[PDB]
């Protein structure tokens, strides 16, 4: 019934020292029924990364929409979009459906190519921006993620330390949520290299 | 229409050690967006080296604790001052809760103490009396924020030993009372930051063979 | 319905209109809402006619049995019996009763008992659907220790206005005077009070 | 929840998962869904946890009073009917129960009674109850034979819970196994689904869709 | 309609769809083919609300056939599945949404690979080795999880499909009157007339 | 009523010339001189304030206009046409950019939008 | 199950160094109608306790009679009824709290919020709350209804925790209460200017103040406020 | 949320807390609730967070265009009129509750706006879930002819009452002071009375704790030459 | 439960009852005997709400068996059917009514006649040559109206019953997993183990 | 809310309380409900604050545009514009407006426009939740062709009673006097009117 908890799944994003990290589970379901263990929720447009939780049809639709919009942006601007600018674009796009919204919980993550500043942001379904320094959480285990992130997180973590923190935050949150799990992916993002790691977790 | 139930907020946490047990709970009491009291004790010493808390609707919580304390008193009268073991107390509480199966005590009950072999024990109850011995159990408003953290830091879930890469789990080493209290305090500090109904103060009751000891700690009052 | 009771120097006077409606139809245009529970203890009835009649009849029974054993009851005692019935059966009653009586010791007394079943001793009381429109008038014009003629004019003018604005109220203005002298009934017709 | 029980040559296998949920929130991964009524009788837990715990514990008290009075082991039929008659009195009040009363006696042999809070009482050879029942039934139906060994039967029950634990979101945590013989039930351990899944995947070659 | 299954094997895609059509009290037909050929190497089965199912399927068929003529070229199964998803995603926020779930089984002639796509009425697309809609998966997925291998032959896939249908016929309360099975491979689409 | 001119008033002549555009450029040629110079650390734009009358307050007539906080414009030709273009240029910087990206458009893209408006007046009915 | 008819609004209270203060206005509202202006909602029990009641007035009168009856009953066969075995605030509260919870459990509540303020035998301050649900709690400051939202914030600025109680004098505490009553008069649409205030001190005993009024009100600035935006005249 | 506005001698001040919540969960512990409509016209918002942000950006955008068109500095009455007519049109479905304050050539102004389109004038105002706690303080300490320093003290104290006593409000106090004939000064995190205490333990994991299945480099760069 | 049929022929009564027991989503059993022997020459089949059906049937069985012992005498089918009707008529105005429909097939040893009684949960009794409960009659009565004769043999009755079951298996959406058939005659009650 | 408008010898006076409530919370205790649509045409607002402000603003626009073309509008014209908005949009409005104005030709005039959108020209008008309690008082005490001082006392005493009984009304009593002399604002504080 509730569109934001039909398909399930989670996204979390964290800032570190000269780096950001964004991670998601791989589950797609029809309520109790597990349907897919390969449904990735993190996409990227150039060097800007976007995680999207919520109703899966809207996750897919919005990914296609922001690919559409960032491609035209690049052709006209003659440069790739930045995380700060993209965040405003995500907000504008969600609010234009104010009285018929996409049932999603987007999460922007990336490093500004000019300033080198790590950036993360979150949104509600309607476009309200949450620009936190520390971390952003989203999905059916957001409470669990808030609890994990609040205790595990400390500022200025190195990329390889940040990986462990966000991975453990995601994994243990997903294990306390029926509609999340079935595999996980973690992106470690630096100014000019990105490493993607698939995590091993319980498959129930 | 008259609604006989209410939500008084609050969060409680029971952890069973090797030869000890702790039952912690915040001292804040609320309705809706208002604070009733910054210090309203929620975890109680019920005698016979048993500690108890009934979190949720405070009136039902107080009623249940009162009735259980009364049950301990009458257990002594009827059975020659015999000590009520934690397992016997747990079964007794099931019958108190299930007695109101069709008009439940709207609470999540946790008791803590020592079993008959001297080992740490925590029992967890649902509103209608289903129960189970558990090693670790958070209850109430911020339970969803605390339990995943405890799975990770107490039971070492999803943690493996470096070098092996997912082949060898981190060994389940025993935690001391000082180590548990750190995890309790950090759990409530984190819960206070991210949950509006949690704050003001943290009161911990520690149960050992020597008796029941109390510890109080300040929490953020916003 | 428009009802009131007013204490004055010589005792107390109860006043009421005579309209009873079923929706917009006037079922009875000459209703007597001033009813006797004891010789010099009367009441004004508002709300459910079935409920207030049933209550009044029970009170009259109680005060009759009281008198047989313990002699004449106080106005306070009568109000207490009304309250006990209205309060304990509040879920199944729609009754708004004003109790008025005359002792020689206490003189004129007025008690009002609204829907809840609470009791309020007052110098004067107003109640019924039409009372809303005369709270301002009654508060400005009431004085303590008025004469009989002044109190009759006060009640007449008050209920006249209540009747004028409240469609649920109307007909004749009935009054009952309670003093040491005895019990006097009064009636005032439309042609008299409308021109005031 | 996923619970099953089936009759075979060597008696009865009982297998259950261990997950408890309140909505999407996983309240517990270490819940006991087999009630040890007495040393000879077992009962499964599905629907209302308190209702099953309370009344099957109560059933054990009634079974004890029976064999004290009658100086004889209560039959699985009589035990199951005490429970079904009780819940039938409460019909309409809102009890939630779906259980298998399992036992092995001389006169009956290995017997399983499905008991319901609607008052239903069914004798049968194979039963699955819970949100993941359909998944467990598939593995059971395709692999079940009366002439299964105690070793293979235990594995079949374990593998069937695993099938449900994987697909059903409200099932998982761990698998509890029991083997019911005429001389009593025998516990066959707690098996974490996380560890069991990878073990079964590798050794059996199943779950090729999942990356390991 | 009720049950529609799909399984992608080594070199083909097999779609099984029930034959029953029930209008409340009576079974009006027991030989209904719940599928449409979108292109020579792409087949779409469907299940959902009455009227909507066939109306949608034929609308998609017409559009893919139109594309085939215009470009003198067959769209890849991936391209067709994306087109179908968008129509359903467009549909869900309409005045009256299409209440239709589909499986798209196709053989990509460019990549020389079979492909199975599962799309529900909301526009939820997933590429799978085997798939189902409605309650069908609840009975069959445990068997498919166990026996399935990506290097299965067409004959082995049919045997595993028979086991799934047998489990459905045993444990489902509804009589779906058996299934029509169709195979999609490099040579095109053909029907298994005996099943 | 109704705008019954739904056809182009600018059209190709046999020689390939677009007459109305050429004539518009002729009007620009008659206009007062304005210029622009780009430096390494800035840009300057300038023009003469040709006062139509000494009684007129030339301060009120602004030939140089702010379009965004970081973009400015100056013109040569018909003043009224400029004034409305500035109004449209200011609005389009918000509607087609700032309200989407939360920041002001870069010079080249705002110029592109202004150019589009001028192109449309060269082809529209 | 019922609905409240004639109602009383906020009751406010706080602890100070030697005792407790409690206050409540003299209004009995009938919905939006300000029907009864002479309703006493502070009811003293003995010389050491004051029970402040808000909510349904008919239920208040019932509770008032229970307490009056409690004093009578305590005096029966009790030579120390005016000494060692006199009624304590803690006894009076626990009795009411039992009744409130029993009544809610029968789905027929006394539709009230009650604050029991008093001083115990040993000189300890007693201040505890109970309501129609049987919910109970204690705090250095307690208030019902609107008082909870507007009075508590102001009273908590004086006594923010337990350690502030010995530092707070009766003059400071009374000043804070009187100011809170003014604030409630400004902002609660179901309040009146007239109120009662009771002080229970361990030395000077029970001081009951009737017919108090809200004074020193600020209204002069209203003359300058014109229109709802653009209007100048 | 707790937001307040206070008039003083030569201007007006607005303040707000910094807690944004998702039901009982705190989403952002340092949210910025003080929004800019124009350089010297600021406002604080409560209710639906997206609506308050969106409606102030829209009116702020139209105010800027209007300012350029008229060659005049924007007025608070213009922001007020444009906000209320917009909110009224949507009949409360845009859940924006605003306190608008600012200075302009006419003088210093303070208004409140409700979601249905009604507006109010006042010397002191408060909005949000902690408005009753804040208004209690304002009603206790406000007076005519406040100085700049007194108004900042009063405003921040009113926000604190909300922070401590209202569960929907918390963390820090933001302030913005708008004085006549001066630049408006935005005081981000004016007060910080809710810093988290140091934790009892560090939860930094040993490297290699997490089990990994696959690794790969992601190609964020464009298609390459040669 | 679902389908229960009855047919009274020349010298016996034949009751056919479905074997399926469904719990919403799954078919828990496919061999359920929805009948109880009330006395040596009286059989009662039943269908209705879960729990109530068996509870009622066994309660009736116990009462008739009690009467048989007390009087050392078997009640006539008419007498049993009247007793059953009264219990159901008593039940319908109770706090929680028995939701049970029954067919009572019996052979009267005094009159040497077979008798079939149809009683619904309201206490609506009717003596019939052939009967059914629920939707079963909608499919079968047209066949029974056509073929039935009061002088049919037991073998002919079974053939007509097979035709009824075949029509049910064709047109009913639900899979009732076949039927258990029992014959009630002068010699008593016996089950037709192959059907 | 308690609002009224009263014609007298020299013109007309509008009166109003200053309380605005959201439930039982007083959102604004110093509200100005007397609002100007033209120089000497004002109105009293009751009902939805959003609706009555939106209406008043539109009327002020209409009368401003009217004045630019056709000169000063009549009080009748203003009432007509109010009516047209209230009547045509009755399904989406909760507005009860009293229109009061001063011409030299017509002198003081008062029009009341209740929920339905109907128009009623009266010597005086009362409206708002608090008006119910003073129908009796106002009817008994109103006279035509009163002086300025008498009319101010009449409005002050009337609204004083309305405020006393209506919890939704309160604060200060604002008044606006409309005569040939000009426009005069008056204010009366609690300490003044409560003791009356
Ligand atoms: Mg699972
Ligand atoms: Mg707070
Ligand atoms: Mg009645
Ligand atoms: Mg009349
Ligand atoms: Mg029994």
PDB file of C-alpha atoms in Angstrom, chain C residues 83-84 87-88 90-91 112 114-120 122 124-126 135, chain G residues 1-2 5-6 30 33 35-36 39 56-59 61-62 65 103 108 110:
ATOM      1  CA  UNK C  83     -27.503  16.131  40.440  1.00  0.00           C
ATOM      2  CA  UNK C  84     -27.174  12.507  41.552  1.00  0.00           C
ATOM      3  CA  UNK C  87     -24.432  12.878  36.942  1.00  0.00           C
ATOM      4  CA  UNK C  88     -24.632   9.091  37.393  1.00  0.00           C
ATOM      5  CA  UNK C  90     -24.932  11.333  32.124  1.00  0.00           C
ATOM      6  CA  UNK C  91     -24.317   8.920  29.210  1.00  0.00           C
ATOM      7  CA  UNK C 112     -28.382  25.163  37.910  1.00  0.00           C
ATOM      8  CA  UNK C 114     -26.180  21.594  33.056  1.00  0.00           C
ATOM      9  CA  UNK C 115     -25.633  18.558  30.781  1.00  0.00           C
ATOM     10  CA  UNK C 116     -22.542  17.252  32.602  1.00  0.00           C
ATOM     11  CA  UNK C 117     -24.338  16.763  35.930  1.00  0.00           C
ATOM     12  CA  UNK C 118     -22.420  19.481  37.798  1.00  0.00           C
ATOM     13  CA  UNK C 119     -24.115  21.810  40.318  1.00  0.00           C
ATOM     14  CA  UNK C 120     -23.770  25.593  40.492  1.00  0.00           C
ATOM     15  CA  UNK C 122     -26.170  31.208  41.665  1.00  0.00           C
ATOM     16  CA  UNK C 124     -29.904  33.804  39.134  1.00  0.00           C
ATOM     17  CA  UNK C 125     -29.655  31.259  36.320  1.00  0.00           C
ATOM     18  CA  UNK C 126     -30.585  31.120  32.634  1.00  0.00           C
ATOM     19  CA  UNK C 135     -26.501  36.553  28.530  1.00  0.00           C
TER      20      UNK C 135
ATOM     21  CA  UNK G   1     -16.847   6.706  27.631  1.00  0.00           C
ATOM     22  CA  UNK G   2     -18.156  10.280  27.679  1.00  0.00           C
ATOM     23  CA  UNK G   5     -19.076  19.349  29.179  1.00  0.00           C
ATOM     24  CA  UNK G   6     -18.239  22.087  31.703  1.00  0.00           C
ATOM     25  CA  UNK G  30     -18.998  25.500  28.440  1.00  0.00           C
ATOM     26  CA  UNK G  33     -18.969  30.009  26.289  1.00  0.00           C
ATOM     27  CA  UNK G  35     -20.226  30.190  31.554  1.00  0.00           C
ATOM     28  CA  UNK G  36     -19.169  30.093  35.230  1.00  0.00           C
ATOM     29  CA  UNK G  39     -15.433  28.078  40.196  1.00  0.00           C
ATOM     30  CA  UNK G  56     -14.532  18.146  33.442  1.00  0.00           C
ATOM     31  CA  UNK G  57     -16.070  20.068  36.363  1.00  0.00           C
ATOM     32  CA  UNK G  58     -18.779  17.498  37.205  1.00  0.00           C
ATOM     33  CA  UNK G  59     -16.015  14.906  37.656  1.00  0.00           C
ATOM     34  CA  UNK G  61     -17.018  17.865  42.063  1.00  0.00           C
ATOM     35  CA  UNK G  62     -17.155  14.066  42.363  1.00  0.00           C
ATOM     36  CA  UNK G  65     -16.496  14.746  47.476  1.00  0.00           C
ATOM     37  CA  UNK G 103     -11.764   4.189  35.880  1.00  0.00           C
ATOM     38  CA  UNK G 108     -15.324   5.166  31.959  1.00  0.00           C
ATOM     39  CA  UNK G 110     -12.861  10.771  35.215  1.00  0.00           C
TER      40      UNK G 110
END
